[PDB]
């Protein structure tokens, strides 16, 4: 939520970048909602 | 030597009676010094060794 | 912007130390050694035999 802010944070979330990298290494309204579900998946 | 030569006569007698060296025992934490002995030690080393008590003349009415 | 010190601890108020108090080693779930006890009578005999020879 701190990164999905509408007006846009001035800075990228490097902490999320690094945590996600380590994790992966170590292992019309309804249509819009479906697209949101796709990005969630 | 400074402590022995500057302390009072009774304290000197106690020092003589004590087995071993008093300063060594104090530093090792084996014997508890007296107030006069601590005062002379503080005079030697330049700093207090316990919370120094100052005497004020204040009274609550 | 550089601060160097001869000793282990630094005096900065709001900066953490690198030399810290020691913590007890973490426990383990296995016994690294096995023990087997001598028979009490033979142990008593041996202790008695050694006692005079030593002291």
């Amino acid at each position: 939520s701190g990164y999905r802010r509408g007006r846009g944070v001035c800075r990228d979330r490097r902490r999320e970048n690094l945590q996600g990298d380590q994790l992966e290494v170590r292992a019309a309204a309804l249509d819009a909602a479906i697209e949101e579900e796709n990005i969630l998946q | 030597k400074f402590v022995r030569l500057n302390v009072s006569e009774a304290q000197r007698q106690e020092i003589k009676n004590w087995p071993g060296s008093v300063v060594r025992c104090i530093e090792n934490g084996a014997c508890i010094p007296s107030r006069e002995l601590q005062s002379r030690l503080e005079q030697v080393v330049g700093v207090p060794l316990t919370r120094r008590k100052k005497r004020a003349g204040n009274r609550r009415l | 912007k550089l601060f160097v010190y001869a000793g282990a601890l630094h005096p900065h108020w709001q900066v953490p130390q690198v030399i810290v108090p020691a913590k007890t080693p973490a426990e383990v779930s296995f016994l690294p050694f096995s023990v087997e006890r001598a028979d009490p009578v033979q142990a008593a005999a041996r202790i008695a035999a050694l006692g005079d020879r030593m002291k």
Binding site: - | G29, A30, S34, T50 | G7
Partner: protein, 585 residues
């Protein structure tokens, strides 16, 4: 420009250095870091944003710990301002105070003292400090307060006096200057501000009867005329009772003012009884107000029989609405003041004792002691002895339930004496609890309290609290001058009879009694050595003997560890050590 900064060799000694794991005195670089290049937009914003974040985080803080942590975090940010200091103080008061000796708060206090002369509203700072209990800082600020009292507003001066009185700090020069400044403005001050000024004087125990008489005359005149930032000029019964309590504290016995107050209170009682719809009862006063009035008259020893009878009649009429604590206090004062042989007084006291014995389970230690005194000072019709015995039994049963009540103030000595009287023997547990709790009250004791507690202990022995007896002996030796000949003689007799104190107190006490007898030529009809070094306490080390032993001078994982060991809070900062590098590699 060229930033001249060098690190020098110095004059240390590190040959055969020994590592003690003690910090060095100071940081090596103490010269100011003067940047020789202009900052960028981001750099300057980060430099200046403390002016917003400090106040924002002070407002967001809901604890003194958070407030002090934020202040310490911004300690190095200059330049702090009077409104910054005032916001910090106000937030501290609202969150509920803090230790005025914590070094984090000492930063704030030292900054306040540094910028004292630049404060426009110094009295507001002083009020905040008094509320926070920073007695030392408040005392220091009087130096700069003194030459500005004549320039402040009268309500500011009244608040200043109240703040000084609240911490019981006497500053006679300041109070005299305040009185001189308020001389021309007193008549126009609101009743609340007059009460504040007089309460400050009472708390400081400055007996300015010249001021008290003027205030009493002003209040009487305003009441006679009678018959949102300032406050009304015309007083109320509450203001009159507050001024009367101030007069009781300062021992100002103004019979005219008390006559006025008695007339007003009798009229109020009559109107309250006349009231009929049960919604306008206690409109002008309350049971606590009645208790305060009765206490005022008892303390001043002014025997207004009509007023006391009217108060007792009102209490009888509407006792179901009277809190048990109010009933206990009223009974105590009325029984101490009036004879119990009067029919009305006896009937009302009997009903009050019935209700109080009913409500014993709700009473605290003070109310219990007052009830014990009142139940014995009363003169009931039936079962005089059984009533007192049952009252004492109930008080004993209730005391055990208040073991941990280390906050309430009461007369431990009188309670113990009542429990041990007429051959009655106190319960061991209750006696132990009471003697344990008596230690808190020693700083509050009078000579009569000393005598009464010693009497109680002597009677109980003839159980013994050796520590309490020793403390009593030491304190009376310190406060020998406070005692009259008879008081000192009886106190020493009781001290000896309750188990003799240590010789270190017994001998000098005898010397003091001896000197007092000579000076006062006092020798009752019924009526040692020099101190030895062996009699001195062994906890101290005034003897030359040496003893085996020691003198012990000592008494989010990263965030938790730093808080536990280093002792400060990271807040938004984050810490990591090399031990966790492989998790990021």
């Amino acid at each position: 420009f060229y930033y001249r900064f060098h690190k020098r060799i110095g004059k240390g000694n590190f040959n055969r250095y020994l590592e003690f794991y003690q910090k060095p005195r100071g940081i090596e670089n103490t010269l100011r870091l003067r940047y020789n290049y202009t900052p960028t937009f981001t750099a300057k914003k980060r430099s200046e944003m403390w002016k917003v974040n400090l106040v924002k985080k002070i407002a967001h803080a809901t604890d003194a710990k958070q407030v002090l942590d934020v202040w310490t975090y911004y300690r190095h940010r200059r330049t702090k301002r009077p409104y910054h200091y005032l916001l910090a103080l106000q937030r501290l008061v609202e969150v509920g105070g803090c230790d005025p000796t914590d070094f984090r708060f000492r930063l704030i206090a030292r900054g306040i003292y540094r910028t004292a002369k630049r404060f426009i509203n110094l009295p507001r700072v002083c009020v905040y400090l008094a509320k926070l209990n920073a007695t030392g800082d408040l005392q220091d600020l009087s130096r700069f307060l003194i030459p500005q009292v004549e320039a402040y507003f009268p309500f500011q001066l009244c608040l200043l006096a109240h703040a000084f009185g609240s911490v019981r700090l006497q500053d006679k020069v300041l109070f005299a200057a305040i009185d001189e400044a308020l001389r021309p403005h007193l008549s126009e001050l609101p009743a609340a501000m007059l009460v504040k000024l007089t309460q400050g004087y009472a708390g400081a125990l400055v007996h300015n009867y010249g001021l008290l008489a003027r205030v009493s005359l002003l209040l009487q005149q305003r009441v006679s005329r009678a018959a949102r930032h300032s406050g009304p000029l015309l007083p109320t019964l509450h203001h009159l009772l507050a001024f009367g309590r101030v007069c009781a504290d300062l021992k100002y016995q103004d019979f005219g003012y008390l006559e006025m107050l008695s007339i007003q209170m009798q009229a109020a009682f009559r109107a309250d009884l006349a009231v009929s719809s049960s919604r306008e009862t206690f409109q002008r006063f309350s049971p606590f107000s009645v208790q305060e009035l009765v206490e005022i008259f008892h303390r001043l020893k002014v025997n207004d029989v009509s007023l006391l009878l009217a108060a007792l009649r009102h209490v009888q009429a509407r006792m179901h609405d009277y809190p048990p604590s109010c009933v206990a206090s009223i009974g105590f004062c009325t029984a101490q003041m009036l004879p119990c042989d009067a029919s009305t007084v006896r009937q009302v006291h009997a009903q009050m004792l019935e209700v109080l014995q009913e409500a014993v389970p709700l009473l605290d230690l003070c109310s219990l002691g007052q009830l014990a005194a009142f139940a014995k000072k009363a003169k009931p019709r039936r079962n005089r002895s059984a009533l007192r015995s049952s009252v004492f039994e109930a008080v004993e049963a209730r005391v055990l339930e208040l073991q941990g009540d280390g906050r309430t103030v009461f007369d431990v000595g009188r309670l113990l004496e009542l429990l041990s009287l007429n051959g009655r023997r106190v319960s061991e547990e209750a006696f132990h609890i009471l003697c344990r709790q008596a230690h808190r009250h020693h700083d509050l004791f009078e000579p009569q309290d000393f005598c009464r507690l010693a009497r109680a202990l002597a009677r109980v022995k003839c159980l013994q609290a050796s520590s309490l007896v020793n403390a009593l002996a030491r304190r009376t030796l310190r406060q020998e001058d406070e005692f009259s000949p008879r008081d000192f003689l009886s106190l020493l007799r009781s001290l000896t009879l309750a188990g003799p104190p240590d010789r270190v107190y017994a001998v000098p006490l005898k010397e003091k009694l001896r000197r007092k007898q000579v000076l006062h030529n006092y020798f009752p009809a019924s009526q040692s050595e020099q101190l030895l070094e062996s009699d001195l306490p062994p906890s101290s080390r005034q003897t030359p003997t040496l003893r085996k032993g020691r003198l012990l001078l000592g008494p989010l994982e990263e965030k938790l560890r730093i808080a536990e060991e280093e002792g400060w809070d990271l807040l938004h900062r984050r810490v990591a050590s090399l031990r966790q590098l492989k998790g990021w590699l």
